[PDB]
Amino acid sequence: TNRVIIFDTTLRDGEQSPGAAMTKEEKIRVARQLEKLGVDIIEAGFAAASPGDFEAVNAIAKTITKSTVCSLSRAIERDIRQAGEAVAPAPKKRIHTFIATSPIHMEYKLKMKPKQVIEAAVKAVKIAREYTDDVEFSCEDALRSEIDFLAEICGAVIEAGATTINIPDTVGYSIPYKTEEFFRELIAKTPNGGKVVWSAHCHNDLGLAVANSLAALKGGARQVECTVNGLGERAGNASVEEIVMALKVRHDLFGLETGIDTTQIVPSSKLVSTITGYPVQPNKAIVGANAFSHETYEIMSAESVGWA
Amino acid sequence: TNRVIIFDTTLRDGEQSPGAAMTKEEKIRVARQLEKLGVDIIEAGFAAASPGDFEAVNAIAKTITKSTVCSLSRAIERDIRQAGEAVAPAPKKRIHTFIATSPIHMEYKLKMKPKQVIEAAVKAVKIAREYTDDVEFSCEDALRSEIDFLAEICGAVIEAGATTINIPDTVGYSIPYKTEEFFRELIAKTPNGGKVVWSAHCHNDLGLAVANSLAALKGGARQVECTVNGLGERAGNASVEEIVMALKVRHDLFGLETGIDTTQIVPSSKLVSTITGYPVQPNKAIVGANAFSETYEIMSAESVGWA
Ligand SMILES: [Mg+2]
Ligand SMILES: [Mg+2]
Ligand SMILES: [Mn+2]
Ligand SMILES: [Mn+2]
Question: In the UniProt record, does the keyword Amino-acid biosynthesis occur (chain A)?
Fold first, then answer.
C-alpha cells in the first residue's frame, strides 16, 4: 500500500542522547502523547538493559492502547524473553532484535563468523515469535556490510518469522540517491523480500537524515524510524515532524499516507523538549519558534501542526 | 569544472531573521571570520536599504580581500548604483540583483507583463556592469514560474551581462529529485546557459535545504547560497557547514571541491550564534554540542574546529 509506518524511538534511541535520561513517569507521559500523535509504533526502551529499563517498558506496555509497544533486544534468547515479558500486557506488541552484519564488527567486535551471526539472528527471531506475531530485525551497520551477506541474513530472518527488516545508516554518512539505490537493490536480492516491510533508520550527521528517509521510501521502504525533534546521540535521528510533514505537504509527489494527527506535532515537540532539556533552535523546521514567522502541493498553516 | 562556489549570505539573508539585525562592527567581525573560513562570496548587505546598510556594506568592501564582497539590489537603477558604489572598494566585488518571475508575482505584485519584467531585469543588469564584471541575477519565486519564461529571462540577462544565475526555492517545499531535474532542464533550455555559473538558494521548511542544494549540484549548479548555522527567516537556509562537510566526507560520490578551511567552521558557528542570539541545538550536524561526543573521509572533531 501507500501507508508509511511511523516507528517512534524517542523513548529508546532518543533517550540515549547525553543528558536525556527520563524517569518512569516522564516516559509514560511522553508515551501517552506519542499515542495521541498517532505514531504506529512506540519503542519504549530496551527491557533487558536494567531493572529500571524493564520497569519503564512494562509500564508503557500497561499504558498504551492504539500504538504498538516495542522493546529492543540483543539477538540472544534471554534478552528476547525479557522483551517479550515486558511488553506482554500491551494489546499491540513488537519485539525489535538486531545484530551487527558488517565484516569488521562481526570479526573483531562480536568475534563471530557470518555463519554464527545468521544462526543467532534466526534463533532470536524464532524465540521472539513465541511472544508476538510482530517482530522487527535490524542489520546493525548495514551500510558497511556486504550486500550478499545482507540478502542472506535478511532472507533467513524473514523465513524465521521477522515481518519488518530495518536498515540503519549507523555511521550517518549516506546520501539520498545512494540510500534509494541501496534499498531497491537489497529488497530485490533478499529471498521473499517483497513479503515484508522494509524500514529505514537514518542519522543526521551530514544534515541528511530526513532526505535519506524519504529516499528509502522511494526505494521501497514503508517504515521510517524517527524521533520527536530528531532527538538522538551525536547529530540525532530523522525528526518525525519533518518526515510526516514532507509527506503531507508533497503528497502530490509521494502519494504516501500516515496515521499521524498533525495537530499534535507542536504539543509533542514542546513536551519532549521540556522533559529532556534538549531545546529546539528557532529556525528548526515545523516546530522551531520561527517556522511560521511569516500549485499541486498542500501549503501548511501554523494551526495544522498544532501552534496555538 | 568541479569547483563549487560557496556563496555566504549570513550577513544579508541571515540578518533578516527576526531579531538577527547586526551592527556594522558585528558585520565586520563576522565578515573577517567568513573570509578566514574561505567562503568564495560574502553577501554583506543590501546597500540601498538605508544609509546604515550602505555604510556597513562599504565597510566590508574596505575590509575583505580574499573573498568577493556582494550587495543585494532590487532591479532598479537607484539600488544598483548604490550597491555598486558601496562595493567599489573591494578587489573582488559582485552585485546581486533580482526580480519575481512567477505569473502570480508578476501580475499581482509587480503589475507588469512578462516583457516589462525582462526589460527591467536587462536594464538593471546593464547598469550593474558599469560597476563590476561580476553580477548575479536571481529569479525570485523561480519554482512557481513557467520554465519557458525562466529560460527566456535567464537568456536575456546572460546576454545583458549576468554571470551567475540563482534559482531560489522561495516557498521551501522542493524535494531533492525534483530540484535536480529542474536545474538540469533549465540549464539546458537557457540560451548560452553553459556560459555562466548556476546557483541554488534552498530553504529548510521541510528539513530538506541541504539535500536540495546537493541535488542542485548533481543537476549542474556550481554555486550554493547558504548561511552559517542555516540562519534565516522561517525555518532558515541551507547550512554552509553541512553542505561543505557533506561534499568533503562524501567526495567519493561528488568529486567536488571548495576553498573552505574546515577548521574554521566551529569558530564561525559560535561567533554567528553569539552575535545573532540564534543558538544551535545539541543535535545539530557538525557544530551542535553533541555532534562529536570505506571510500569516505571520516570527520574528526578537530577537523571542523572543536578545541
Ligand atoms: Mg532527564
Ligand atoms: Mg545581535
Ligand atoms: Mn538512531
Ligand atoms: Mn533564504
Answer: yes
